[PDB]
């Protein structure tokens, strides 16, 4: 889920940016090097809503670089334990299901649900099909699933989705 919390970052600014556009260069550098990053504690950041303040720039002795502590507000999104999360479904292989909730490589195995749900290769678009063939889980539809697991994969997350709870189907 999407939170809105306070983050901290340090900016090493080269002396070539010590001009009238210094603080703007600091914001541009922050926007450059906080986007597309994930951590095992504060979650995957989405975007920087605003920057609270730019700290005092301490000049490092021995280097020209200046260290700028930055306090800012960023949207974070990580898996949670015991929570139901909306998901996106894509094409189905002969082994598993490809689900992508933003950057999440969430997977559904054969040891998370009872045998009321099956998959067949006879249909030209592969999809999850029951015996009654009422609910269809194919590419680009709305489902709900529960995640309990979380792992770190070098700014990537590996998790497992569950479908044990009822009414976790299409709207």
């Amino acid at each position: 889920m999407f939170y809105h919390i306070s983050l901290e970052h340090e900016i090493l600014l080269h002396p070539r940016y010590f001009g009238p556009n210094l603080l703007n260069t600091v914001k541009q550098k922050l926007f450059t090097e906080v986007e597309g990053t994930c951590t095992g504690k504060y979650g995957f950041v989405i975007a920087v809503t605003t920057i609270d303040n730019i700290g005092a720039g301490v000049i490092q002795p021995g280097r020209g670089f200046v260290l700028y502590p930055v306090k800012y507000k960023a949207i974070v999104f990580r898996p949670f334990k015991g929570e139901v999360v909306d998901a996106v479904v894509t094409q189905v292989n002969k082994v598993g299901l490809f689900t992508e909730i933003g950057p999440m490589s969430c997977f559904i195995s054969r040891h998370s649900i009872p045998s009321e749900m099956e998959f067949d290769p006879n249909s030209n678009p592969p999809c999850y099909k029951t015996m009654d063939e009422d609910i269809v889980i194919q590419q680009d539809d709305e489902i709900r699933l529960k995640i309990v697991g979380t792992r770190v994969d070098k700014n990537d997350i590996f998790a497992i989705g569950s479908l044990m709870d009822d009414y976790l189907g299409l709207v």
Binding site: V95, G96, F107, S109, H111, S112, V148, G149, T150, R151, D153, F158, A159, I160
Partner: protein, 273 residues
């Protein structure tokens, strides 16, 4: 039988009045351990032998294999049955079926290397898999060879320049896309370079550890004077006899026989004697 219990691992109770209690191992002994597991919501401290225990893990934790055919591989479990436990590896998405006793709780990162080798002094290569007595090396063929240990080592050119189909300059650790060849459509990262070939890596590609080779033009960016006695035949040092210590295309370092000096002389003023 055999027992291999390590501290920090999660174990359960399978029989007795204290069944279904999961705790963390602190120490281990030989046969009758009298182990001390840190149970959940329990401050009073218990004792359990080795036969009563079983390596049961919670769902979604980093596991490693201690022995068997699947040893040396890590992953995350999906569901622990009575005796049927499955996991997916960190390298490939192949389902691994392991016994519950053959699993341990560790926080280390999986290993899953890639140095430049020389099969013969005209061909370079990169090893894809470490074996006991052989090297599995993918050269510029697309075919993996199997050679002995005693290949030689060549100095890698980390400052080499390669050209793609757009005639753009690329270097080491650059992401390039494949738009031509037998494997067009994939994407790789530059590790080593040649005159007309480039080595590529894709972490999602599962064949030979992600190593591959593509041609450079089918991608797109996403002295004899040394040691010789010479005579300075011109200039202020004319007539001095010396031995060239170092030389370039223009100047030469001449070690004068008569003095203790080594001087820089233009090579147009030197005559080999």
């Amino acid at each position: 039988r055999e027992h291999n219990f390590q501290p920090g691992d999660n174990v359960e109770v399978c029989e007795g009045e204290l069944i279904n209690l999961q705790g963390k191992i602190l120490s281990v002994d030989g046969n009758k351990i009298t182990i001390m597991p840190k149970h959940e919501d329990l401050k009073d401290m218990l004792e359990f032998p080795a036969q009563e225990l079983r390596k049961y893990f919670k769902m979604g934790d980093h596991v490693k294999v201690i022995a068997g055919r699947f040893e040396g591989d890590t992953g995350l479990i999906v569901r622990v049955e009575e005796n049927f436990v499955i996991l997916f590896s960190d390298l490939t998405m192949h389902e691994l079926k392991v016994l519950p006793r053959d699993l341990q709780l560790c926080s280390e990162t999986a290993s899953g290397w890639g140095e430049l080798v020389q099969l013969d002094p005209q061909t370079v290569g990169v090893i894809v898999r470490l074996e006991r007595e052989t090297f599995q090396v993918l050269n510029m063929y697309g075919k993996v060879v199997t050679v002995r240990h005693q290949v030689t080592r060549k100095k890698d050119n980390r400052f080499a320049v390669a050209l793609d189909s757009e005639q753009n300059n690329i270097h080491v650790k650059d992401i390039v896309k494949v738009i031509d060849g037998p494997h067009s459509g994939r994407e790789g990262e530059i590790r080593h370079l040649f005159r007309s070939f480039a080595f590529l890596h894709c972490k999602k590609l599962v064949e030979n550890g992600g190593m591959f080779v593509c041609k450079t033009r089918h991608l797109v960016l996403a002295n004899e004077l040394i040691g010789q006695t010479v005579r300075i035949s011109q200039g202020p040092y004319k007539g001095y006899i010396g031995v060239v210590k170092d030389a370039t295309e223009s100047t030469a370092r001449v070690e004068l026989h008569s003095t203790c000096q080594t001087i820089s002389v233009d090579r147009q003023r030197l005559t080999t004697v």
